[PDB]
């Protein structure tokens, strides 16, 4: 009997948005709150920006708690930021990020000040699914409630799915771009992209 799960490779795109509120005292500063959120990277940004140019937007536009939230890095205008490799760790998969430092407001005496930082993160993870393969997990411990074999091709549209049809897009003739070597594969592939509320998987 087969007990080992079915394993495959997946890619996670998400923006870590951190907004901090700081009180500046006479001789000290204090963190009075830090809101940390994870936002999905839209399909229009995974294909047009990350895969075509290797860059990512410096703004996060997403939906959270039934509201369209927009966040700007360093509270500045929107700009393209190059994806650079993450710092090496032992026994770890490949990863890429744009920002390195957290942004905090400039010191002004006796005020509460807010500051926003957006870090666009791309990660390669291993995904495991077990029988009857109606959902799969990721290396980060986040479940994806959709069959790994779901699609629009050759009767693979009868598989299980728990997400609206707006969140799944299957693109054929996708030419993958390696983010380190900057070399694009020649063989076209069928790529499934799903936008979960907290991250995007491909």
């Amino acid at each position: 009997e087969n007990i080992a799960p079915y394993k495959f490779k997946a890619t996670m795109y998400y923006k870590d948005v951190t907004v901090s509120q700081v009180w500046f005292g006479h001789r000290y500063s204090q963190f009075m709150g830090i809101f940390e959120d994870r936002a999905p990277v839209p399909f229009e940004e995974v294909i047009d920006k990350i895969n075509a140019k290797g860059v990512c937007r410096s703004t996060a536009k997403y939906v959270r708690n039934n509201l369209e939230t927009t966040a700007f890095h360093r509270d500045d205008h929107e700009t393209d930021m190059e994806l650079k490799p993450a710092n090496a760790a032992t026994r770890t998969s490949r990863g890429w990020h744009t920002t390195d430092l957290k942004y905090n407001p400039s010191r002004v005496e006796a005020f509460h000040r807010y500051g926003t930082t957006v870090n666009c993160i791309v990660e390669e993870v291993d995904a495991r699914s077990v029988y009857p393969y109606d959902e799969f997990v990721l290396a980060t411990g986040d479940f994806v409630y959709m069959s790994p074999f779901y699609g629009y091709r050759e009767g693979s549209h009868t598989e299980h799915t728990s997400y609206a049809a707006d969140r799944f897009k299957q693109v054929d003739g996708f030419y993958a771009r390696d983010l380190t070597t900057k070399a694009r594969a020649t063989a076209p592939t069928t790529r499934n992209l799903l936008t979960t509320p907290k991250f995007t998987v491909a």
Partner: nanobody
Amino acid sequence: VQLVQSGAEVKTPGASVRVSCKASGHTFRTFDINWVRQAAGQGLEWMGWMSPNSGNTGYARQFQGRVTMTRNISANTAYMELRGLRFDDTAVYYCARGPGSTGTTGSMDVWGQGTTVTV
């Protein structure tokens, strides 16, 4: 995937034409369909894009109101209709897989044989 178009078309001014492009090998619902025309000895002239999965369309500014794109999912076919033809519409027409719903940076990797339309 392979794209095959219809035969040559000969029409009178003021009529309408429907050109069909059928794809083979895939479900036809994973990629968009671009219609682009070329005059005799002239440069390429993009006409429009159509998403066969959702049916959303997008036309050029100079072709708005005269071009209608539709689809038959059962046969995996895409139809493009030009209404109110004139003398300058005589051209070779191509269907391709390119930009649209699947992304605005896509490339027209696969092309059709092209249909000659004479007015």
